[PDB]
Every structure is written in structure tokens, then in C-alpha cells.
Amino acid sequence: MLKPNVAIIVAALKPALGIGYKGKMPWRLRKEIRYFKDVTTRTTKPNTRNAVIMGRKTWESIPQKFRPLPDRLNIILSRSYENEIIDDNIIHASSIESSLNLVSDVERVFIIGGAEIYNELINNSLVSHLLITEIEHPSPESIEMDTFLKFPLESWTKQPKSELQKFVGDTVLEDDIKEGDFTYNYTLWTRK
Ligand SMILES: NC(=O)C1=CN([C@@H]2O[C@H](COP(=O)(O)OP(=O)(O)OC[C@H]3O[C@@H](n4cnc5c(N)ncnc54)[C@H](OP(=O)(O)O)[C@@H]3O)[C@@H](O)[C@H]2O)C=CC1
Ligand SMILES: COc1cc(C(C)(C)C#Cc2c(C)nc(N)nc2N)cc(OC)c1OC
Numbered sequence: 001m002l003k004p005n006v007a008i009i010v011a012a013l014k015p016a017l018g019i020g021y022k023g024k025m026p027w028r029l030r031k032e033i034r035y036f037k038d039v040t041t042r043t044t045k046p047n048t049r050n051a052v053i054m055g056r057k058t059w060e061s062i063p064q065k066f067r068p069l070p071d072r073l074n075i076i077l078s079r080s081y082e083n084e085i086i087d088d089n090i091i092h093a094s095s096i097e098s099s100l101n102l103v104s105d106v107e108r109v110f111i112i113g114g115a116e117i118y119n120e121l122i123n124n125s126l127v128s129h130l131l132i133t134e135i136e137h138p139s140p141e142s143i144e145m146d147t148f149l150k151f152p153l154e155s156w157t158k159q160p161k162s163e164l165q166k167f168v169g170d171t172v173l174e175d176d177i178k179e180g181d182f183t184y185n186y187t188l189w190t191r192k
Contacts, residue, residue, distance in 0.1 A: 001100040004109045006053075006126045009040065010118060010149065011133035011184070018145035019115055023061060026143050029179045032133055035186060036112075038171050039131065041071045043107045050108040051075055053096055058113035073106055075099045077117065096126065115147040122151050129167070130156060130189035135182050156189040164188040 011032055012019050020026065040052055051073040059067065059076045068074035068089045077099070081092040085102060093099030100109065110131075111121055121127050130151070137143060165173060167188055177184050 001103045001106055001109075003097075004100055004106075004126065005128045006096065006109045006111060006121070006124070007129035007131055008111045008118060008121065008127055009036065009131040010113070011036075011135060012149050013135045013137060013140050013143060013145070016140065016145070017149035017151060018140075018143065018147065019113075019118075019149060020147035021144045022146065023057065026145060027135070027179075027182055029135075029177075029182060029184065031174070031177055031179065032184060035133070035171070037069075039168055040069070040110050040112065042169060042171070044169065045107060048105050048107040049073055050110060051100065051103065051106045052110050052112045053077065053099065053117075054112045055114050055117040056081075058117070061114075073103065096121070096124070115149065119150045122149075128191060130187075131164075131167075132187045132189060133184050134187055135184040137182055153189065155192050157192045159188045159190055163190075 010019060018026065040050055043050060049072060052069055053075040056076055056078040074089055075091045075093060077093060079094060081094050083098060083102065084092040086092060091099050091102060111117060161173065164186060173186055175185060
């Protein structure tokens with residue numbers, strides 16, 4: 001796969017864009033999790049799949065029984081990994097481009113975490129889309145948070161809902177979804 005168009009997918013708490021605390025997620029938003037599954041899994045052309053790419057720490061955060069994430073090609077990046085195809089669902093590499101050089105029959109490519117990987121790849125020109133779940137809370141400062149996005153969104157344009165709807169197909173997009181004290185919306189951004 002040569003020069004794939006790549007999408008970042010992430011859920012972040014406004015306005016600071018916090019995404020984690022002590023190696024874990026600061027919320028459990030069940031509908032958001034299902035959205036993540038549906039969007040990363042679904043394909044538009046028959047007999048293909050998507051790839052999901054992540055840093056080693058993010059991979060290790062998934063319970064070992066629930067990785068690899070089913071129905072998607074999982075790619076894990078470490079600075080200690082040489083290129084290795086582990087099995088049909090798992091690749092080890094040290095860059096996204098090299099990891100996908102090894103790959104055919106993949107439609108979409110998603111970056112699924114974590115902060116370090118996000119904050120590098122936001123400035124990689126292969127990344128053409130951001131799928132950001134913007135989470136809001138009445139008192140965001142009260143949520144324990146130590147990992148943050150550093151996204152220069154001035155160089156990006158938030159697209160209308162119609163563009164997001166097109167991207168996700170017939171996936172149902174509900175507005176202002178509320179779980180506990182959190183309220184969230186699905187968004188799509190492209191390069192300005
Ligand atoms: N809210 C959300 O939507 C999401 C939040 N998260 C959160 O993010 C946090 C994890 O993020 P973070 O701790 O930054 O870790 P990452 O998941 O981003 O992994 C970092 C590791 O990836 C490898 N790596 C980083 N850059 C490169 C590179 N350029 N080339 C090759 N390998 C590289 C290194 O592995 P090595 O050390 O082996 O060399 C590094 O230690 C957790 O708290 C998690 O819950 C994660 C996903 C989504
Ligand atoms: C697939 O579910 C998980 C996803 C994840 C990761 C970190 C890969 C994620 C994510 C993610 C979500 C939930 N939403 C959005 N919008 N983007 C993401 N990258 C970690 C998990 O355990 C900690 C999970 O439970 C098994």
C-alpha cells in the first residue's frame with residue numbers, strides 16, 4: 001500500500017483536549033466505544049478490511065484477550081520493533097508507511113492512539129482526516145488528566161455533518177449524546 005490516506009480517530013475532552021490519565025481512559029462512554037468499533041470496522045468495497053495503527057503503550061492497554069481488535073488489521077509501532085508480520089491480523093513496525101508497504105486489500109487506515117503517536121502524526125501529510133469525538137463536561141478541570149492532544153487545529157477545517165455522514169455511511173450519528181456528566185459529538189476535520 002503506497003501513500004495511503006490516513007485518518008486519526010480519537011475522543012477528547014474540551015477545551016484542553018485531554019485523552020488519558022495514568023495510561024488509561026478517564027471515561028467509559030459506551031456509545032462512543034461502539035462508534036469507534038463501527039467506524040474502524042466498516043468497509044465500502046467487498047472483500048476488504050481496514051487497518052488500525054497504534055503505539056505500543058495503547059496496544060498494551062487493551063486487555064490481552066480482547067486484542068487484536070477483531071475484523072481489522074492491527075499494526076503496533078515501537079522504536080524497538082523491526083518489521084515483522086506476526087499473523088494475518090498483527091503487524092509490528094516502526095513507521096506507518098513501512099508497516100503498510102507490507103499490505104494489500106486494506107481500504108481505510110486509522111490511527112487509534114495514543115497521545116505520543118497522535119501528536120507526531122498530526123504533522124504527517126498522509127493524515128488527511130481527523131475524526132474527533134468532542135467531549136464536554138460542566139467541570140472539565142475536575143477530571144484527572146495527564147495526557148493531551150497537541151493539535152494545531154487552525155490548520156484544519158471542521159466539516160459539516162453531511163461530510164461526516166458520507167464518511168461513515170449509514171452509521172447513525174446522534175447529537176449531544178449524554179453519558180453520566182459527559183456530553184459528546186462526533187466531528188470530522190480535513191486539512192485547511
Ligand atoms: N481518549 C482516546 O480516544 C484515546 C486515549 N488513549 C490514551 O493515550 C494514552 C497512551 O498514549 P501514550 O502514553 O502517549 O502512548 P502511545 O500509545 O502513543 O505509545 C507510545 C509508544 O509508541 C512508540 N512510538 C512512539 N513514536 C514512535 C515512532 N515515531 N516510531 C516508532 N514507534 C514510536 C514507542 O514505543 P516503545 O516505547 O516500545 O519504543 C512509544 O513509547 C493512554 O492513557 C490511553 O488511554 C489512547 C487511544 C485513544
Ligand atoms: C476496543 O475497545 C477498546 C479500545 C481502546 C483504545 C485505546 C484502542 C481506543 C480507542 C478509541 C475510542 C474508544 N474512541 C475513539 N473515538 N477513538 C479511539 N481511538 C482501549 C481499550 O481498552 C483500554 C478498549 O477496550 C478493549
